Design a binder for this molecule. Structure first.
Ligand SMILES: *[C@@H]1O[C@H](CO)[C@@H](O)[C@H](O)[C@H]1NC(C)=O
Lengths: 182, 176
């Protein structure tokens, strides 16, 4: 299906148990913003946009209400057909050309995520890294699966070994995408 | 300065594990807003069972799961839904998507290195870009890489690296 530009609006995803909802917008792939449902607030991926345009968070909270509703409906109709757990595919690569000593961002691209529940964690030399870690929302695929990106701010050095650890229900053992300056 | 949403409508029924439901609103633009298309999807888990479509003009069952659903949504939301091609699509594009996305220009950082030389083009937006070596063969580039922060990157393998990207007035070059 061909075009010039593709905007995703009203893209909603509810799931249970846990009442886990997610509402987002996109444009040519890149996420405009998501809506923090707990805090009823629009959170733009690029702040400049949030200062130029506005999205009433309520318009997103309704699709959640609608999708929460539709979920219980289709669940019964489907004869309580549970979602199947697909295995994710991780990939690690630096945001910009590697330079020893100079600030960079390490990116962990994860694909084939379903359901939209995952744990992408970072490891420096087999050590949990919490700070300087940033994720995207769950971005939709035509598969009606999801992909997600994790970002690690770091200083490139040859004596550092990095790992992207992915924990999903579709996995008996976590993925461990190895990456290092070498 | 108001971006609007595409309404995912509530359905009707009749007739412990983990379950998922998704709604997808999608606008496909060409020549700006000359040709605009609105596809709508209702998805239990990963099964799209119901769908609206500008080109079709109405809701249609995609699978057995949306069989009596198509009729319902037509009787109910066909009115407001068909109109969303202008209240949401044609709107968002001309009003909120131009001053932001379509206006975003990000200049690429070029840098060559010996792994076979690798020309690293990074942090550029939009995706539209053309790069050449200064030869036709011995060439091999990676697929365009989406960083997910509204910047792309691509690495062409193989001396000047010529790069022509919209965000630039004059195509920049880098020698080795
Ligand atoms: C659920 O159960 C009914 C009764 O056996 C069956 O006929 C129907 O096909 C099932 N629903 C679907 C769409 O899987």
């Amino acid at each position: 299906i061909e075009a010039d530009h593709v905007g995703f609006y009203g893209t909603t995803v509810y799931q249970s148990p846990g009442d886990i909802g997610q509402y987002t917008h996109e444009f040519d792939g890149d996420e405009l913003f998501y809506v923090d449902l707990d805090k009823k607030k629009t959170v733009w991926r690029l702040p400049e946009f949030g200062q130029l345009i506005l999205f009433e968070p309520q318009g997103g909270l309704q699709n959640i209400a609608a999708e929460k509703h539709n979920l219980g409906i289709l669940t019964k109709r489907s004869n309580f057909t549970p979602a199947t757990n697909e295995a994710p595919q991780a990939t690690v690569f630096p945001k910009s050309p590697v330079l020893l000593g100079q600030p960079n961002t390490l990116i962990c691209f994860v694909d084939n995520i379903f359901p939209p529940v995952i744990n992408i964690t970072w490891l420096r030399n087999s050590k949990s890294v919490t700070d300087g870690v940033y994720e995207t929302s769950f971005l939709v695929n035509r598969d009606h699966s999801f992909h997600k990106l994790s970002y690690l701010t770091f200083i490139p050095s040859d004596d550092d070994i990095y790992d992207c650890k992915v924990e999903h229900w579709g996995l008996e053992e976590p993925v461990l995408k190895h990456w290092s300056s070498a | 300065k108001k971006m609007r949403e595409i309404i995912g409508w509530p359905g009707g029924s009749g007739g412990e594990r983990h379950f998922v439901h998704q709604f997808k609103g999608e606008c496909y633009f060409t020549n700006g807003t000359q040709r605009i298309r609105l596809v709508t999807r209702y998805i239990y888990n990963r099964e799209e069972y119901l769908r609206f479509d500008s080109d079709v003009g109405e809701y249609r069952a995609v699978t057995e799961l949306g069989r009596h659903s198509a009729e319902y949504y037509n009787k109910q939301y066909l009115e407001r839904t068909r109109a969303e091609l202008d209240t949401a699509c044609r709107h968002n594009y001309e009003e909120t998507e131009v001053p932001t996305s379509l206006r975003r220009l990000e200049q690429p950082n070029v840098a060559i290195s010996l792994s076979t030389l690798v020309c690293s083009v990074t942090d550029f937006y939009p995706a539209k870009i053309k790069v050449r070596w200064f030869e036709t063969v011995g060439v091999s580039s990676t697929q365009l890489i989406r960083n997910g922060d509204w910047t792309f990157q691509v690495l062409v393998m193989l001396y000047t690296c010529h790069v022509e990207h919209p965000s630039l007035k004059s195509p920049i070059t880098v020698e080795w």
